[PDB]
Design a protein around this nucleic acid. Sequence first.
DNA 1: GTTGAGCGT
Length: 77
Amino acid sequence: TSDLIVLGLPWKTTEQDLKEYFSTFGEVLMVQVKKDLKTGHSKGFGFVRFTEYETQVKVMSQRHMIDGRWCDCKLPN
DNA sequence: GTTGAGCGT
């Protein structure tokens, strides 16, 4: 398993929210929501790591409606 | 108090 980058997150979406959402597919190791260090405002993308590689491809294969926006899980660059 | 292609100290 590898980290997946999550593009398109609503600005209000928190690491708590991601954990909840992604947990529905499989077991989650960690989630991150990248934020500006001065203001804490989310930058609109984050990361996720699953324990099971099965869950990763399942998640990588489809778009995701998270808090009102379609999001994409890709392999980072 | 804003936005929507954005890739991580």
